[PDB]
Structures are given as C-alpha cells and as structure tokens.
Design a protein around this ligand. Structure first.
Ligand SMILES: [Mg+2]
Ligand SMILES: [Mg+2]
Ligand SMILES: [Mg+2]
Ligand SMILES: [Mg+2]
Ligand SMILES: [Mg+2]
Ligand SMILES: [Mg+2]
Ligand SMILES: [Mg+2]
Ligand SMILES: [Mg+2]
Ligand SMILES: [Mg+2]
Ligand SMILES: [Mg+2]
Ligand SMILES: [Mg+2]
Ligand SMILES: [Mg+2]
Ligand SMILES: [Mg+2]
Ligand SMILES: [Mg+2]
Ligand SMILES: [Mg+2]
Ligand SMILES: [Mg+2]
Ligand SMILES: [Mg+2]
Ligand SMILES: [Mg+2]
Ligand SMILES: [Mg+2]
Ligand SMILES: [Mg+2]
Ligand SMILES: [Mg+2]
Ligand SMILES: [Mg+2]
Ligand SMILES: [Mg+2]
Ligand SMILES: [Mg+2]
Ligand SMILES: [Mg+2]
Ligand SMILES: [Mg+2]
Ligand SMILES: [Mg+2]
Ligand SMILES: [Mg+2]
Ligand SMILES: [Mg+2]
Ligand SMILES: [Mg+2]
Ligand SMILES: [Mg+2]
Ligand SMILES: [Mg+2]
Ligand SMILES: [Mg+2]
Ligand SMILES: [Mg+2]
Ligand SMILES: [Mg+2]
Ligand SMILES: [Mg+2]
Ligand SMILES: [Mg+2]
Ligand SMILES: [Mg+2]
Ligand SMILES: [Mg+2]
Ligand SMILES: [Mg+2]
Ligand SMILES: [Mg+2]
Ligand SMILES: [Mg+2]
Ligand SMILES: [Mg+2]
Ligand SMILES: [Mg+2]
Ligand SMILES: [Mg+2]
Ligand SMILES: [Mg+2]
Ligand SMILES: [Mg+2]
Ligand SMILES: [Mg+2]
Lengths: 258, 184
RNA sequence: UAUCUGGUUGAUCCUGCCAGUAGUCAUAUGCUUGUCUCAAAGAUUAAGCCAUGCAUGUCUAAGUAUAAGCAAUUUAUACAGUGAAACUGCGAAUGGCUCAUUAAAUCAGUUAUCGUUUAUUUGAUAGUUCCUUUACUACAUGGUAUAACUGUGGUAAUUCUAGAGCUAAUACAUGCUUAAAAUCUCGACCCUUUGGAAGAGAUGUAUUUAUUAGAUAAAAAAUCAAUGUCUUCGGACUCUUUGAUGAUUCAUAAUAACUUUUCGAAUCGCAUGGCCUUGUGCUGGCGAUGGUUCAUUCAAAUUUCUGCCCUAUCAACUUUCGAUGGUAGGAUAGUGGCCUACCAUGGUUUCAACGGGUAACGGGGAAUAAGGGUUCGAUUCCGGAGAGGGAGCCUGAGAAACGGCUACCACAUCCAAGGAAGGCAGCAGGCGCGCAAAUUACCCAAUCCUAAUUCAGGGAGGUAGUGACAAUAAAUAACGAUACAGGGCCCAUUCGGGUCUUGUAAUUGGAAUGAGUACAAUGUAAAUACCUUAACGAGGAACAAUUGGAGGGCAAGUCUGGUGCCAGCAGCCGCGGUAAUUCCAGCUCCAAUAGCGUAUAUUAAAGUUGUUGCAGUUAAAAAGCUCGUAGUUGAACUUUGGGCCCGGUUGGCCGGUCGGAUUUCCAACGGGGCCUUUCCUUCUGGCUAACCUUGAGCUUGGCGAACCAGGACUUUUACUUUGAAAAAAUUAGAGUGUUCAAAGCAGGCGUAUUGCUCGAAUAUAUUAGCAUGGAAUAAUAGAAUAGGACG
RNA sequence: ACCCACUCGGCACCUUACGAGAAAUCAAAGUCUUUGGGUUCUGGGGGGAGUAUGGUCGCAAGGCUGAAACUUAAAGGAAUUG
RNA sequence: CGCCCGUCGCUAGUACCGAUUGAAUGGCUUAGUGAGGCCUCAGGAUCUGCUUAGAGAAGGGGGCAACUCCAUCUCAGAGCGGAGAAUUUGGACAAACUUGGUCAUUUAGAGGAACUAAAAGUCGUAACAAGGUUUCCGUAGGUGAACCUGCGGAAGGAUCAUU
RNA sequence: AGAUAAGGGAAGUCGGCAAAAUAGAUCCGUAACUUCGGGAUAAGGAUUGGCUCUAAGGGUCGGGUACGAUCAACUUAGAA
C-alpha cells in the first residue's frame, strides 16, 4: 500500500533460505539488485546461516564494511545484496571461492570452486534486442546487458561471461542433447539432458528432461538453464549432481554411511 | 507478530465418564504401575490411537507402495527401538494389536522396579523424582521416559547422589551433627 | 477412537422431541491453587472519548563550518583534527494498530499489459552544445541571494515570528572548452552537354507531427525508359542489408522540420606518480556523488476465467443528468462512458437479476469429525480498507498521507478574551461501556528497518511485570522392625514352632528428597527467573488438595441427627405432607485432580436436515384433477474377434553368496509393435534413418521425423490418468535425548592439540485455469430438393 | 346368444408370506443398512396458528401465500389385559 | 363416582388492532444555499537587471584664458524587461447546512379483540360406549355457552354379509 | 370606490367575514383512499427576458430498355 514495502516478516520469506521460524519477527529483505528476491540469497544469510562465519548482522556488517567479501569481482558492501543463481563469491581472505548453485532439495549449496572456475559465470539470455543507434544487445538472467553479441545468440541460450570484463567468451545453444540445470519449481536442482521441447504457441513452452538414471520429467522453459552438452559440463557440479534420490534410497544411503 | 509456538494436547478423556469395567481396569493398571492419575493412561491410549490410525491408513494402501513401505518401516523401527514391539513381530498388524500395558512396561518407573533397585514401583517413582538415578550418565526425574532398549545397560544410580556416593545426604549429615553433639 | 442412556403407558412396540453424555487455540464466572517449560490477552458492548510521557529522523575520507565550540596541529597563511547549529540531500508513503465500511465488491488460485508509471539498486549507455558558432566569451572555471550566526523587538501563549547586517553549496539561476571522416542540401564560377565545380550550412540525445524501410515458398526468359557500377559500353553482373514475437503501425534506423527547449559533470575525498622544450608546463590512479536513455530489480495500476452467507412477506431491474454500445475528441501514466459532443436502443434476470439483511474484511486456516459433513475464522502470515465523519490538496518516484496541511460538521483544550492549538483503531496509561481483557517498567543486546550511514535512531522489536486464556512435564511420601489375621511347606509328636507371605495398628525407627530461603557462579544490554550449587530447610497439630456428588440416567449410603408439601433439592424423571437412601448437617464412600464446577454458543451424539442417508395409508407430511414451460432424466445400434512377435514387474528350484542375490526356466500380471478389407493427416526442406545399401567376413550408393523447422488443414466437449503450478506457518509425517514431553530444527563424530560430517525430507493442498495419455461411458456434427468426397 | 381353451387391457376379489412393516395390515405399503431405475410435491415435538401482519385474487363470503412473541414434556400412532 | 368442552367472572403475563395527519433515532435523497482548496481569466503591492537620460556641483587630463574631454554627490524623466504577494472572473470537485420526501428500527396510546396460564369460581354437558340426536369434513345461517340445523360428502361406523 | 404599510401574523371575530397570498407555460415529482374509472393542477420544487448562433422536422421537379436542382413553412430542443 501507498508505495514499496521495505520489511519482510519471517514465515513470509522463501523457505529455501532455511530461516528458523523463531528468533525474530523479521527476515532480511533483499535489496533491489540483479535477481528477484524470491530466487536470491542475501549475503547475511549466506555468511551467517550457511557458513557460520558470523553470528549477527552486526558481525556481517563488520565483515562487509572492510571490503573483505566480493561477489562477481565487485566488493558489494551491502548486507542485503541479492546473490542469485551462479553468482560467484570470492573471499580473498581464506582464498575461498563459492558459486551459488542449488542442491537437489531446492536450496543453495556451499559449492567451493577453484579460481579458474571463479573467473567466469554463465548467463541465460532473456531477450535480444536492438538498442539505440542500432546496437544489438542481450539481457542475461542477472540483468547484465552485453552489447555486440554474436548474431547466432538467440533467446534461451547460455553465454559464458569473462567476469573481469563483461565480455562473452563463448555460448551454448538450446536444442536436444544439452545438459541443463533446472532453476524453478518442483524439480528445482535436477540436471537432465533435454530430449525434446513442445511449443504450445501462446504461453509456457514445455521441455522434457531426463536425468542420468533415465527418470524423465517436464519443465517450463522459464526454469531451465543450459550448462553445456551431455557429459562434460561447463561448470563444476555440486555433490549428487542433481539425481533427486527418493526418500527410500536416501535413508538407505544414510544407513550405509553412518 | 512473531511466529506462534505450536502446542498440542497429549491425551483425550473417554466418552462415557462412569463405567465400572473401564474404571476398575484402569485402576488395576494404575495400581500395578504406580501412577497418580488416569491422565497417564489417557495419554498412552492417545498415543496408541494415533499409532493405530497410522497403521490403518497405511494398511488401506496396498503393499509395494513407497509411502506404506517407508512409514511402516519407520514406525516399526521406532517401536522395536523403544522395545514396545518384539523383533519377530514386524508385520504392521501386531502394531494394531498392541495395548497400553506394553507401553507402560517400558517406563523408567517399572524398568527400575524390574532392575530391582526399588523393590516397588512407588519406590522407583520417588527415587526417580529424588534424582537417585541416571539412565546414561545423566540424571532423569521423569518416570514416563520410554527407554530406548539400549539404555537398560546404563540405568543405574546417579554419581552425584546417595546410593552413588560422594556425599552421605541431608538428614544423614544432620544425624552426624546430633551424634557429634552427643559426643561432646 | 463407526457405542448411547432416562422420561408419554396399568403394561407393550413405535413416531417424536425434552433431558442426559463427550469436546472446544469459545468466552465469562465461582471455588481452589505447590513446582518446571511455553504462552494468548479492551476483538465482541463504544471505528466511544482521551490527561500526561514517548513512538522518525539521519553522515562519511568523500555537498556546504571563521561556532565569537572543544582541542591540539606545530604538516601547513586559504582550509585541511573533532564538531553543536543551520542550509542541502534522502527518509518520514515502511512499520505498527484496528475491522467500521464492504456481498462479484474485497479476496483466492489463474492470466495479461502487443494497454501503462516505476525513486532505488544492478548492467550498459552522450567526442556532435563556443550560435553570423574570425572577439560574441572565464574555461587553469562565471553570477546572485539566503539560512545558521550578530544585533534590535513583539505579544498571555504555540515547533509563532518581523525589521537590519554578513556569509557558503552537489542551493538556485547561467555557461564554454575534443577528433576526424562520410552523407545531404544549397551552391559560386568553368560552361559543356558525359556536363563538372571552389565555397557555405546542416547532420548527438530528448519532445511533437508526418512519411519511408523494417522483406523474403520457387525456377527462367521478352523487349523497351535510360546504357547503371567497367568495358573488349558485347553487356559478364553478380555483390545487393533486413532482427525478434503466436501476432503489431514492434525494436531500431532514415528524411522534413517542430520545442516557450531536456540532457550532454563549473561537484567532492585519498594517492600523489611519469615525460621533458623545468613551466605550478603536459600527462596520470583508486573511488564518491550526479546525470540522459534502455534493460533489470523493488513495486504499483488496471485486467482474463471460475468461485461468496441468508432472504421472493424483494420479480422485474438499468437508462431524467451514463444505463449498453458506436464514431470523434478531451483527460489519464496508460486501456476504457473515465468525461464531453453526436448517434443507436441497447444491457441483466427463475441457471435468482435488482433490492433487503448480515450480531459479514476475504483467504491461508480453527474446532468437532468412521466416511460424508456442520460451525467458526476481529486476531501472530498474505491481500484489502481506515486514522472522529465527509471532502479537497501540497510535496514527492511513490500519499487523496492524516504521529502532512486546508475547509465544514461533531466533540474538545488554553487564555492577561485579543486569539491560539486539536486528533492514542501506535506503546504504556485514564474515563466510560460493559459478562468480559495486563506495567503510564528496562533496552537497542538479538530480529530487522531507515539515513549522508559499521558508529545515530527505532514503545517496530526484544526483555522483564500482571496473567489458572489455553497447552507440556510433574510433589503432596518411600522402606524397615514389633502386635494381629491369612496360604502353601518342614515337621504330621495333642491346636506347638512356624520359616516365605499380603494387609491393619492411641506401636516405633533410621534414611531420601524437593518446595522454600541463600554465599557463589551461570544467566542477561544490565538484571529477575531457569539449569548448577556451599550452608540451612518434613513427622504430622506439620510443608495439612481441592471441586462436585452418593434414587435413576450415571461411580458411590436403606448410616445417624434436624425439618415436616415448610425450608429447600432436582439439566430430565422426580424427593419433601412426623420412620426423607434425593432437603440442612455429621460420618462414610465415590469421580476427576492442581484442577473441578456453572452459564452461554457450537460440533459429535443427530440416519432429529438424511448426497452418502430420513419420513409421507393410520404417528407431521401426496397439491382436488389434468395440461404444461424452465429444470432434471431419457430405448437399442457403428472395430469385434483371431493371430504373430518384442521387451518390463511379480514370482520359480538354480542359492551356483554366506538370513543376502542371479540367471537359461515352466506361469500370472500389466505394455508396445505388426498382420488379418483396419489412414492410426500430409507438403516444402534438410538428419536420410533403421539404408536394396556387402568392400573379403565392418564397405563406395535405399523410403524425412525416430532429430527438427516452417506449412495446409485441422467436429466440438464432458469425464478420467499423469505432470506442471497451487507462499510460508498450520495438518499428517521422516530423522533427531528439548533430561521425558508439548516443542524446536537441531545436531553428531574425532587423536577434541589443527578439525571432519549428516541434515533442515516427503505427502496433502478442493473447484477453476494449463499441458499430456486414454477413448469405454453421456452428449454433439456430418453425404439426402446431393450447390457430397476422392482426382 | 351360450360352452371350452387361450390372449391383451381393465374394475376388483380369495389364499399365503419369500418379503415388508411399529403394528393394524400390504402382490404393493415387496425387490430399502446386501441402503442409488427416472422425477415432482410435502413434513421436522406439541400448542400459539393456518392466527397476526404484508401482498395478490374475489362483488362479497372468503381463497392462495404466511410468521413471531409466548408457552409446554410430553401430545400422538398401532396393538395388549382389564 | 372415569375423562372432558366452551361462554361468563377474578388475577397475572405475552403479542395484535387502534383515533392521535403519534413520537424518537438512523440511513438515503430531491430542491435551495453553499465553505474550502485545485484549474483558469485577470490583477498588480512590492523587489530587481539592463539601456539610457538631463540638470546643478566635486576631482582629474588637455587649447592653458574663456574653453574642451573622462570620471564622482544630487534629483527628475523615459523605456526594454524579469520575479511577483494580496485581491479577482469563470469552471470542475464538492464538504456542510436548511426544508421536504422516502425507507428501516424501537416507542407512547383511551379503548377493542385474542391467546396462555393460574385458580377445587358460575352456567350447562358438546366429545370419548350407539356418550344417550353415530361422529367428522366443506359451506351457509342461527342461538347464553359449549353447540344446533340445512345441502353435499367421508368411515377415521355402530354395517366388509341376502344369487 | 381604489390602494399601501415597519415588527408580529388571526392574539381579531359567532366564525379568517373582508383582504392578502397562489396563479400561465415547460420539466421533475406526486400520498392515503378507491366503485380501479379516479384522487391529480394532489402535495411539492426548478425554469422563463433580450441578442448571436446550432440542430432536427417539408413540398415540387428531375433518371437506359445513390443523388441533384428549386421553392417555403412556424414548431421543438440545445448552446454561448
Ligand atoms: Mg533489506
Ligand atoms: Mg400418550
Ligand atoms: Mg408411570
Ligand atoms: Mg442435548
Ligand atoms: Mg465487530
Ligand atoms: Mg502498513
Ligand atoms: Mg545506474
Ligand atoms: Mg477514445
Ligand atoms: Mg464510447
Ligand atoms: Mg462489519
Ligand atoms: Mg494485515
Ligand atoms: Mg491511509
Ligand atoms: Mg476514536
Ligand atoms: Mg486524509
Ligand atoms: Mg496518532
Ligand atoms: Mg493505547
Ligand atoms: Mg467433599
Ligand atoms: Mg447437594
Ligand atoms: Mg450406581
Ligand atoms: Mg440426587
Ligand atoms: Mg447428604
Ligand atoms: Mg453419524
Ligand atoms: Mg425423522
Ligand atoms: Mg397424518
Ligand atoms: Mg390424490
Ligand atoms: Mg420441459
Ligand atoms: Mg438431455
Ligand atoms: Mg476442461
Ligand atoms: Mg382380465
Ligand atoms: Mg374395468
Ligand atoms: Mg424436529
Ligand atoms: Mg413442529
Ligand atoms: Mg389408539
Ligand atoms: Mg356442574
Ligand atoms: Mg362442570
Ligand atoms: Mg353432538
Ligand atoms: Mg353428551
Ligand atoms: Mg352425540
Ligand atoms: Mg362417535
Ligand atoms: Mg336450530
Ligand atoms: Mg388423526
Ligand atoms: Mg404590516
Ligand atoms: Mg382567529
Ligand atoms: Mg380567537
Ligand atoms: Mg376575543
Ligand atoms: Mg369561539
Ligand atoms: Mg373570502
Ligand atoms: Mg385529496
């Protein structure tokens, strides 16, 4: 009402943050940034609740204000900066590098990566257009604008970003036999090797997707992120690599390693 | 505007207040197990009703169902873990065939009585309440504890208690003071 | 945990209700109350009124400081440390409270903006601006105020202000400084026809209008209008640029201009470096702030479909002057009768319109439930609406804002009567109203939010106090020895001991313990509690458990005394009239127990609302009879059977592993393909695929979906399967020593010296909408004066 | 016109109870807890009361629609023995 | 010697009709008047820049003698403007008030007419047996009251019955 | 005989006698009751001038085997 909201109560936050329902009435509202606040992770909850490197927002602020943490090469000393999918986070102290990817339960994992892998990121192009004076440009999933792309780069493709400059090194197209990451919905976190896509001109192009264990499913085209061709991926996959074990085999593995 | 604390009721009163069969049956149970109300029996029958309802709505589904397999194995495991259900009986119908005395046989009160440190369930009750017990190496003063079939090897007296040493006791120290006065 | 019982009768079986019975995150109230955890709390009546005090302000290295402020720099003579005030910039449109209004309205799920605004982030993004643009000009940077401050005053008073004197900006209001090339216009002049020119001007972005491009399934030829790039002027002729969407007049670009003319940095902090033609010469980093446009993000505004309680003792409603629509224009950020002008007569309704009522904010949800269901939802989350009732509006990206103004109305405050100031449905608190709801406490330590921002602020929030609203756990005693009374067994020797016993005692003992104090420590922003713990702290007259009842229903008195149809009891039947199992007491006993009763409302009981699942001859109820529209329902019939294969699940000895697993197997179970008259859409293309393709036993060459793109068409549904989506919390439920448990989402494991590691699942979530398989069941259409199909 | 046999459609009747029902009784009042052929109307303890009021029809008498307050633990059905 | 109906009379309670063009409260609304701010037509207090501009006097530079040129105190006067308060025209939004109208909910009322109880009141005895005239329905009329009578109907009859 | 009167407004009088007020037209709105025909101009409100315009409402002639020309009305509505 009357303007934008600036608070976010607990029990209204997205559940994949794993914020406890006790310990405060409010949740850290992500500031405006490159991602939607639903599919984002504030640096406060990432540093405190996933890494345990801090206990308070005061300690997170004390870490941020001395320019220790940087994300996508930029320092970003904001407590509620929305870190989203495949954003890289570099901590020069501890020489740590994380890449924000979903685990198969649908939450963000602490996926430690090396420096040569932290030197880039992939972006799913959302629209290709002609800017002013006829300059073509793309818009990635994190709102990055990249001018003068390759003319073969159409929508729903993946571009590899230099992450020091904003240039494109190469790009992956979108058709059958491509390794994808599911980012959104019930199947959020699986990796499943497109077999074919159905059009349905008028809304919500569907795509059929089968994992390494031949368990197929289907997803809207909004939630799919192609990350290479079948076999080799262009990034380091987290543990499990998006299989979505059933609860039976999950407790069998928990009884195996114990 | 904080998240409300969840709470639940743990028992249920019976429909008919006064019937002699239920009355003297539960009074026999209370006398044999050393309880202070019918509320404990009501709580145990409530837990048994929930368990039986889960078994019923699992049995309505056929076998080879993942939900039936998963939660039936989980429930059977939890019952054989607490020791209310024997190891041979793991077929989800003996779970329905259980009764409240099987649950009352696993309380710490009757377990202390069976281990023989009490000589009576009321002695076990006052011992547990007076902290002269340790189910592992930790004092527990709740008689309705539901030992987990591995703790009977560790049910014994507390180290920081009489019958475990390290201090005689309050009225013992008093009597030592009075007999030192008579010594003077 | 799918349960019934008492009451109509002289007795019976029924119908039928009354009463009982259990529960309530449903309240109130009575009596009583020891402990631990957790915790609602002026909603209901009055969205009634409010004393007082707080709840929104804010700075860095980085906008402005001569505080006549504090310091000491001693590096400083412009400043440069800190820093009140004030200007400036942001914020105050969030949060919090309440549920008055509101019944297709809100709201839920589901769409859309190819119909719009968007501060803030985040990512990109202005060489074009000196205007006769050769003095018009500061571009090592241009102007004017003004606050704070000094000083003079006013009034009874207010977060009231006047006059005078300074002074600043990222305040206002002006204003320049950077290429080149290319293309267009005009065009001097040479003058030729093939005609060429010197020179001048314009050409960023933003606004407005007009116009153009923004394309394309295929192949060649005939000549002209003039040759068109270059010629061997035969004409070889190509190159020709065109992105996206299902779809656009889209994105974008280009011409003609239009604008009272936007923007295109006169801003700030650190580091002070390189080149020399050594001048305060030229270059030069890391940031901050700002800035036009696009995109993104936070949103907002409209918007598609379907869904809302009770009423017909509301059946017709809407349209004067907006009702439904059309055209055009205004207005809006935009669509649109949103408004105006003209024009038409439309639009809704028994499939419940319109009107009325709601002791109606909607939903997530809550209680009770064998199933189905019934009732509630002011209230911890989401979405609305409101700030005493209306209306209007400034500022700003965002308000019809109220801890912002203006007016009226109603209440109401202070006056030295002139005038001034008001909005607790924010936090406490106070009057009222009531059957009914707490402290005018402490703190920003957590959770978060705002600011110029690590630092300040925050009655948001947290902590404690009141608190028998509800929930969780759980004391009020245990064990002996003596004295009686048993039941077997040794003796079977009279009735003698009795071992081992299960209870009773004007029998008696030592132990154990917490409630409660309390040194301490822990706890916490600081405390109080909790968990620990010195010392103290049970023997009964103590450290003493209540509430209701004892005819039945319905557990437990034919015990005693009093009363005598009186007093009274009794949810219902009933008790009481001088022998009361029912009143008042005592004794005893019973039910639940720190809780129990009472009232009211609701659920089950209630198959006494009946879809599941009632009854209608006589207990209540077939309309007097027939017709008949809406509604509901509606005969049968159209590919069946037979085969042949392929491969999945359950089995089955083999167990060929030591109660785990495999294969050749008899069978069942569900799938797919092919054939039996059985098209079960095909055109352009490509992969040509499985390929007659066979090179000697792994080689050179078949038919497009099995991989696509576009296509032409394409009977429509209902139903059902699967899947996407359906916020979290709640519900069910997996795991897990909160010490158990309600809970919570934690935790667990090591050589604990350096660390390692599992989690925080899953399911349900109607209806509507979306995609998908099936194609029985129920509808629908087709070729019959053939203006039918194939071709 | 009768008689016999049969058949369709009627008004009914007699006997039994497989069945139903509280019973009286019922070839429908059966095929209804083993609860679903299609469909219309009506009832929710007894009074107050088919009353009051408001509509609408009728010349009128009246008809159709149609409450509430209040009150009550029984009214009532079928059979049994007196 | 059971049960049982109604009038009338007393007492208490509930609701209804009711003259009073009753009353009060609340909502909506016609018409009239109409604050406020907003948009517009003006308006111009005041403040302020520029172009000048002339007179009268001071100073300075120059034929050095009158005289000539440039500056300073004075005050008219003219324009070119810019900002701009009060006030004001018209418009739309429109609070609020007045007077009516209408709807809804309570609320007074002489009197009238019901119902319910209570109470062994008065008068009869209508129904239950063939209830002593068989009961009951519809309709009409009448009578102190239950009720009676007429027409038609019913068996819930006192008849399942005369080949 | 005709009129006008401040403030009040039937206190005057047997009695509002007399006088005053109202009045036409257009638009809106119109109750009880009813013999359903009425009541009804119910009650009760608004508007009305001049000037300059706009709109609508007609006749007669004209077409091989949609329209044009011409002439003339007072009726209503609206706007400055
Ligand atoms: Mg935030
Ligand atoms: Mg009876
Ligand atoms: Mg009796
Ligand atoms: Mg009841
Ligand atoms: Mg309310
Ligand atoms: Mg809010
Ligand atoms: Mg930016
Ligand atoms: Mg329009
Ligand atoms: Mg229109
Ligand atoms: Mg309400
Ligand atoms: Mg809310
Ligand atoms: Mg508001
Ligand atoms: Mg108020
Ligand atoms: Mg307001
Ligand atoms: Mg306030
Ligand atoms: Mg308050
Ligand atoms: Mg007692
Ligand atoms: Mg009593
Ligand atoms: Mg009894
Ligand atoms: Mg009694
Ligand atoms: Mg007694
Ligand atoms: Mg039931
Ligand atoms: Mg019934
Ligand atoms: Mg009947
Ligand atoms: Mg009939
Ligand atoms: Mg019909
Ligand atoms: Mg049909
Ligand atoms: Mg459908
Ligand atoms: Mg016959
Ligand atoms: Mg017949
Ligand atoms: Mg009923
Ligand atoms: Mg009834
Ligand atoms: Mg009878
Ligand atoms: Mg008599
Ligand atoms: Mg008599
Ligand atoms: Mg008679
Ligand atoms: Mg008689
Ligand atoms: Mg008679
Ligand atoms: Mg009779
Ligand atoms: Mg007579
Ligand atoms: Mg009868
Ligand atoms: Mg006069
Ligand atoms: Mg008079
Ligand atoms: Mg008089
Ligand atoms: Mg007189
Ligand atoms: Mg008189
Ligand atoms: Mg007269
Ligand atoms: Mg009249």
């Amino acid at each position: 009402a009357r303007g934008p909201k600036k608070h976010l109560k607990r029990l209204a936050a997205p559940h994949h943050w794993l914020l406890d329902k006790l310990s405060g009435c409010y949740a850290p509202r992500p500031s405006a940034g490159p991602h939607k606040l639903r599919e984002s992770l504030p640096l406060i909850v990432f540093l405190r609740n996933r890494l345990k490197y801090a206990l308070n927002g005061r300690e997170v602020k004390a870490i941020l204000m001395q320019r220790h943490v940087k994300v996508d090469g930029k320092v970003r000393t904001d407590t509620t900066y929305p870190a989203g999918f495949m954003d890289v986070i570099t901590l020069d102290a501890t020489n740590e590098n994380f890449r924000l990817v979903y685990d198969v339960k649908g939450r963000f994992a602490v996926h430690r990566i090396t420096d040569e892998e932290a030197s880039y990121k992939l972006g799913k192009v959302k629209k290709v257009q002609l800017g002013k004076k006829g300059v073509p440009y793309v818009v990635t999933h994190d709102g990055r604008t990249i001018r003068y792309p390759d003319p073969n780069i159409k929508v729903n493709d993946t571009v590899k970003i230099d992450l020091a400059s904003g240039k494109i090194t190469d790009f992956i197209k979108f058709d059958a036999g491509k390794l994808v990451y599911v980012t959104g919905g019930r199947n959020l976190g699986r990796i499943g090797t497109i077999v074919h896509k159905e059009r349905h001109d008028g809304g919500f192009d569907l795509v059929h997707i089968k994992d390494s264990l031949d368990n197929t499913f289907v997803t809207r085209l909004n939630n799919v992120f192609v990350i290479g061709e079948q076999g080799k991926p262009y990034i380091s996959l987290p543990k499990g690599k998006g299989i979505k074990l059933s609860i039976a085999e999950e407790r069998d593995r928990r009884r195996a390693q114990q | 505007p904080r998240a409300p604390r969840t709470y639940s009721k743990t028992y249920s009163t019976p429909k008919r207040p006064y019937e002699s069969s239920r009355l003297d049956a539960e009074l026999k149970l209370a006398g044999e197990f050393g309880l202070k109300n019918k509320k404990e029996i009501y709580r145990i029958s409530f837990q048994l009703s929930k368990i039986r309802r889960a078994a019923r709505d699992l049995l309505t589904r056929d076998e080879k169902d993942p939900k039936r397999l998963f939660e039936g194995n989980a429930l059977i495991r939890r019952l054989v873990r607490v020791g209310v259900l024997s190891e041979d009986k793991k077929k989800l119908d003996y779970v329905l065939a259980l009764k409240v005395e099987d649950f009352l046989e696993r309380r710490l009160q009757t377990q202390v009585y069976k281990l023989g440190l009490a000589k009576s369930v009321h002695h076990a009750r006052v011992l547990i309440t007076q902290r002269h017990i340790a189910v592992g190496k930790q004092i527990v003063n709740i008689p309705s504890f539901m030992v987990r079939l591995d703790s009977e090897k560790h049910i014994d007296f507390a180290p920081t208690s009489p019958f475990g040493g390290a201090r005689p006791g309050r009225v013992a120290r008093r009597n030592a003071a009075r007999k030192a006065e008579a010594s003077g």
